[model samples]
Target chain A: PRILNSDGSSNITRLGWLDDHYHDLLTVSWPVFITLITGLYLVTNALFALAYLACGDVIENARPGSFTDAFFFSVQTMATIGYGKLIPIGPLANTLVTLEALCGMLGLAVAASLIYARFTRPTAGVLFSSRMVISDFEGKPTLMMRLANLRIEQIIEADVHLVLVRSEISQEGMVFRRFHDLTLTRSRSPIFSLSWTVMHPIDHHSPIYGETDETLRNSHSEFLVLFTGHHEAFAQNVHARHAYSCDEIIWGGHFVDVFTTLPDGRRALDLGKFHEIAQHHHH
Target chain B: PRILNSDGSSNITRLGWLDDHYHDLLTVSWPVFITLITGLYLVTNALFALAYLACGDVIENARPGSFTDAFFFSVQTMATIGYGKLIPIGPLANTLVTLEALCGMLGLAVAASLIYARFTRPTAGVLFSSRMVISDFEGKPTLMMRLANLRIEQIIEADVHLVLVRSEISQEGMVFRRFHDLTLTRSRSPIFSLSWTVMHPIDHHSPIYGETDETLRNSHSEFLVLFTGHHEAFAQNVHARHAYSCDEIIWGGHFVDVFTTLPDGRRALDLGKFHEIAQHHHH
Candidate 1:
């Protein structure tokens, strides 16, 4: 004998909904919904806040007591993971079990959506090649940059871009800006093994010329080579380098056909002094 | 001696600087700044990300790691503390450490800002009176809610709501929604314990009533009470009661003016009954 209104809020309806067989009505349905999507807003913020306090890294930290213990107990309660790492031992702790579990259900929704979004989104791990070559297409040493994948599975609809930059200090302290065509549309995608060569004439003042690997290593020290492209399987990766690492193009751990008889003798620069040279590393 | 031009990349300048005074620079200014900053970042993000991951209750379900071991490592790494409770033994583990340290720094920044935002932001802890009164405000036995708290600290802006959802369903369902507004102003300011009371007259249609304490306990099986509020000091707390043996509540507990009246009444609702009670818990 209960009175319930059509609207969602009423004692008879609310109480009756809770009074009878609770397992079917409350435990299974709503809890399942909450657990499915797991979330991490306040609950996380709260825990981190505690961890923040617990670690004593924050100012005016909260004190430890039954409340902190209860908060943790609630967590195990809600997620129902019950690692048995912690549990509600007393009456107050037991009282909080239900409240915490309810919060856990709501958290699941947000967490689940984040998971779905992450998986559905495309991702690509970047692989880099050594050497930006300046070779003669028709006599003059032309600026050349080459790259290929280390692990080549089928890559469909891939594109690449290259950018060159210079750093200048101003009121902004130091700033780096990009300077290059930076666009690559088509390449040897059908074949598993391939090489790409971009050639440009090197003038007396060209940043690419008279640059022994040692000189490139010294002059600018760090050079940025950016590759921007999309693949059906892999997403996007940008490979940047200090000028020298890109002085000699490497193919899947070995040098290729064109590199066999380049009269320069040295691939791109003098490495005779490299190993003997002491490398100083700063943070 | 190493040579670098004035307009060199940061990497070159850094490398050259390191080479010039190798011995003198080993533990000096430049190395100190860079190492400290790098370590700071590494430690912070490692901690934050780990904490973020923890919300999933991943630790609870972890295969067989010791709880003390995991917690110790988490605190150590997050705080940039190398307590050596556990140590990395391989390359993969080393990699995890590097990444963890990087994350730890980010966590520090995040924590610092959150603390300032909470501390500086105007705030007021919702002081629900710890005293509940039965009075003739409008007529019959009306339940009056009274609350107060001293130490008016600045807390984050929050909303306070009160609702009486059944205890059992909430235990299992974990459902809570903002159901009541006890204040005209939605925001609060720090006050040294302000008290407010509202009376809910016990009428024939009212869910809570004058049935003998024993009769009510037997008739409905159980009842629950919930109070929810947001605060910068404590983030947010969603309070509730469960499996009370009587209408009276216990003292020195959360949201418990009416909660502790018939103190010790809570032996009824344990985790065993949680799943059953929560089945019907929802507004």
Candidate 2:
């Protein structure tokens, strides 16, 4: 079973709409957020229209028993447009206008706040290679993966951590998942503006030192990667995570170099082949 | 020199208005945000009014060269009120109307987005004790500090770290600030809802082991605390930080107990004296 979805959402159960409504609203897709806002806006106007219609013929120059006219009047009042074409004359209608005005102001304020929150939420535009590669590095087998910063702004104090998780059986006959930290050669970067190749040497003391692809698959192993750094543009700490199953790890594979020297002395990077890998023969 | 302000802002040079405009807008006070939005709204309408006035007698049923009429008509057009009272007559006025309509929709969307961002920014309601205490705990001198969750919601997987920082002279005779981690007795709490007393035993391995109040003051020492956890309500990772200057450390002091058992076997907490401390007699 996957611990996290491809989108980075955990496989844990969530309360959805009931628990943390604000979180749900902020995390939802743009289309969903807009749809929700539009639906609520229309529903509020319709309810206010019904209340206005309850006060029969109270609004001047409005067709009696016409829901559309009442609804349009409500929208005008709520938006504070006061078109002046359809005026509220009676005391009841005036009271409704006052109530609607207050409601409209509060509603608009809330709507604006939610929209802003969604727009400004800090996001880490870090992309990880689809597959993990194990190949020779300085005569030692090393696990490697590539990651690139999609944003143009630099990420300062960037750090990455990798963990190998596998199911294990205890002496008491209880089976549970256990996580082992994979030490990286270079875990911290002062500034990360482009691509980074993370390496974990499979030495004698390494967690997956003697584990083969078949063994890893049998253990239902997973490699989890976590990236964290301060986004220079947002001036906020941003985090990104990715996970690779045993099947996603390639043996004796190396990533294709994406860097090229341009004719004008400028270095160029082609992210188009960022995930491309080449197989190497083992000694 | 204080590294962090009372509001938790760091003492560092920032680009202010020029850099991270969105961040500045979101982080500003509610009053400031509202004032800027209102000012911009008025200025935008005024500009549109000027454009309308430049085209002489382009607006129907309005006195020519009347600024107030032009302004109101601009407002009506921008808000899609279309009161049908003051109408645009010529091609120039109609063209301006189309441009204003598109601008109004886009401007409103942006305004709403910003408002939502400000309203929904995740904030940690964690309050730290004004002063840190050094007193006896299990026959050993220990540094202590209190923190409480101002919100009713719990913080899960809560972790707190303390660092002692002071200006020091290196072996190369270079003067620089160095940070030393202080090991806490219970740094990780499964759930943090009420008050917590963080303790660091001042043993041989401790950073502030033999440091006195006078020595600490002379060294320009500060205790920086960082609190991080997943907020239950926001369902987001929230972080809080505080810095205590040498003067803020209370010697031979202990926090006043704020928990009391009620007659009905219920426990009541008095956050009123959360910052109150009592002096203890040293051996």
Candidate 3:
């Protein structure tokens, strides 16, 4: 048995315990990032203040041996407030303040850009139907999946790629994973502002054309989907990926239509019911 | 014009001051990972000890108000040493110790799996030529790029895909990115143990067929290459991607062959000059 999950997903990455999971950590909620940065700013200033306290009197300010003055001074220096009310007179304090100032600039630039990138990144909220279906398309058995744009932002030149990964035994009795690209009927859309049904016609060249569900299960098959499109709103390329196991593929089912005309003639896509499908309806 | 560098690379990401680039962080040197994990283990144990110290009189055999004793006890609890020499007595201490033990289990599991994943993941050290070239192939101008496998591992069924992303001004007076797939002459290789030269013949169906370098520059063209192959060593798929801008493409140049045979009949590849290309003499 493979160490990965049946769906070919990594379990360790999904756990994501410590700062070790830096990817997910950076992409967490705004509340978490803001709280973390604020708390860190305060603690960093406090740590530097403690260091200044450990050193001798080196400030031009009036107070000595007073942590309040040092803490305020640290805040001023770290934020580049540079009020000149509590300037450093001693060489040691000057060195420390310069270092702290540099750190402050670095931290500010980093946090600002990170927060800005989070807001500006074009994450095309492309929703995928929960189940993949094997149905009929143009008088041929076709594998189909449904995708919809949940946002008003336009996706230009949308493209889709699908691959089937299955276990295969070679002539030398060696078992290995094999990948085959599945061609889509219409792989690209000039403007993807609405729902699109992706179809893969099962012909002679198709990998899963003649294979039954039982054979697919024994082969440990997985269908991988990679979707990419240009974000017209942000002028960037966006990507999404998903994987489906054998059990997730319905043999004769199809996704139910989610878009309908309102009384006022405006089209509305019901995302709440996007995952609904008609089972055993395909012949 | 956009603020991105002319080479199509981002400055902020390369600086890496804010969030660590997740891909580089994952594929860093072995020594870096080792030192990082070891330091984290020690620091986590120390933090737990400080927590135990905050709530005093919790240990039976540990000395009161002594951080040394508390630290050792914490080490044992965090590692699940369970020698029973020092035990938690008070209910507060018991709860904290149990919590530390659970954290220890999670830490161990996560760390172990991450390390295992790092080792087992197949990394195809595929080196791409620094510049792309427009050279002659079968009496036609072909867009070509070279790639080589630097590692001893064999990759079977290697495939390449090329896409052209260009700036397009819509009829609505708006600029956006458009994608076009470039058809390759031979996209897949059964045995990819050495160098592979990828070629895309510029035929009638080509999008950039009668286009000049000036037109390409005006369109702000970018050639994106995606290479994927099956790693025989790990029985998994490995992928690499690269982007070449207009300035990096040579008009009529070609890559210099680096393979040679020694007098003793041993073959050797001169990787030291793999990036060197002969200037424009494709005729």
Candidate 4:
């Protein structure tokens, strides 16, 4: 199994309830989160109602054996609406009310914090091209990939790193995976607001210099890209990663031009063709 | 006024309502946030109650022209308590209920997201020593500062940078400020869980090489430290910064030893003495 999934998520299984509860709570879908919160609210109200029944007839206007009235009373108390219909009269019932009120405040506070965390979590709005390309660049065959910032804000001091991982056999016949750092033509940008195309020259020093497409495929080579930058609007560091298996690399294609100059002075970027590619012309 | 305060917060003023609303909401204190939420809830309920009253006598059990009853009914609907004592009877009243229900869900979601954002914000629990010291290290005079990770989790691939900023005069008599990068003996740590002491040798290439305590103070010099690392538990990049004015730098003292060896062969770090310093003894 792949250690890193194509979607930039780890493939390792974790005991979410025991070790990743907070992360799971923040990452679950909105519908699931809402359902979880609602279920918690209902369960808490039911437990408080049971406690109220244990102190029989303490609620001045409620029926002695009615769980429905007790639950509604619990809701009214927890929500702080009161409604003035069901009132706790005796000392025992009033004590439970006090305890429930404290619980209500604490519970609400926790719920509010969780919601805020999910909303404000930092996420990089970066989009990577669907495929990597190998085509002519400055009279040389260069490995290339394109990425775009989908957010309106600029990412300052953006840095990119590329690594090639492949199976290697040592002189002693030991087979293991090896990693090679791919040097890019331009790896850092002071401010990245739009699209960026990173290129690595497949020169003599390149790890894939002598390897053919078939050999790379046989070796199960993979390319990993890591990006890190400071989000200007959030004032926080954001990270993004992508992985490209051998099959995802196109041997002789280049990305379709997404930039066009208008009749006027301004230039426009057509994201509609962001993933389009064209075959390289052979001389 | 200081641009960067001692608490590591910028002192610049901002129009919070217009541009910094999200940041302000996420950073406000718990008491203020609770008050704001409560106030919002009450105001929303009151507004919906007015709308219900406009559809006069549409509620089955509510008295005519009673704002109090209408408000209580609105509360019950919004909180989803639905005591069933005051049900909307007409289409107009029911329509208002439908709108209020949607609003309630949206409002609660926003509140929850905000709360979660505030709760899950990544913060580096790195503590800087109260003072910096110029002491003998490896038989050379070095400027040193101590820092410790207050959290139990380790910070991976931690990097630290030190800069000396001071007032400078240009050749043409123009006065300005300049920043000089200070080279530390060790600037990176694979894992930082406990205390770390960073040192910069006051050699020929050092910015403060020939400067005495009085001279540094007269030059209005300050040392700024920036720390960045991946928080292991949060799985996010965390940053922290600290500033030390010239007056906070001691001329000739060394930090008190904070490490001790136990009889069981375990080393212990005492953070209580992290800031303590001892004067060098004269031979």
A37: Cα error in model 3, Å: 5.3
- Candidate 3, superposed: residue stretches over 4 Å from native: A1-56, A60-62, A82-103, A117-120, A259-273, A279-283, B1-283
Q: Summarize candidate 3's per-residue lDDT along B1-283 as a digit string, tens digits.
A: 4323433343254442426654554687978966666677668767877888799767877778777667666755665544355688888888999899799668656655555445445456688888899876567788988888765555655788888888888899889978899998768654455677788889898888988899999998878888897654444568777778887888878777665555655545677657777784547
Give the 10-residue window scoring lowest on summed lDDT in candidate 3 chain A: A7-16
User: Candidates' TM-scores?
Assistant: 0.27, 0.53, 0.47, 0.57
Per residue, candidate 4 scores C-alpha lDDT tens digits across B172-243 of: 988887889899986865445566788898899998987898888777788888888887547676889998
Best of the two (2, 3) by lDDT:
2
Two-chain DockQ for model 1: 0.01
TM-score: which candidate is best?
Answer: 4
Candidate 2: interface RMSD equals: 10.7
| Model 2 bad stretches (over 4 Å) | A1-107, A112-283, B1-20, B27-32, B53-56, B90-92, B276-278
- At residue A215, what lDDT does model 2 achieve? 90
* Candidate 4, superposed: residue stretches over 4 Å from native: A1-72, A75-109, A112-283, B1-5, B9-20
Measured against the true two-chain complex, the DockQ scores of the candidates, in the order shown, are 0.01, 0.10, 0.02, 0.06
Candidate 2 residues A1-283, lDDT tens each?
5654454333422110355466677667899999998898889999999998887887779998888999999999888787788866545875576556545655777976776556765777899999999989988999999889998999999988777877777453435455566889998998999999999999998889988989998888888777778899899777776778888888888999989988998998889889999986667
lDDT of 4 at B260: 53
The 0-to-1 C-alpha lDDT of every candidate, in the order given, reads 0.35, 0.79, 0.71, 0.77
Highest-scoring model, DockQ: 2
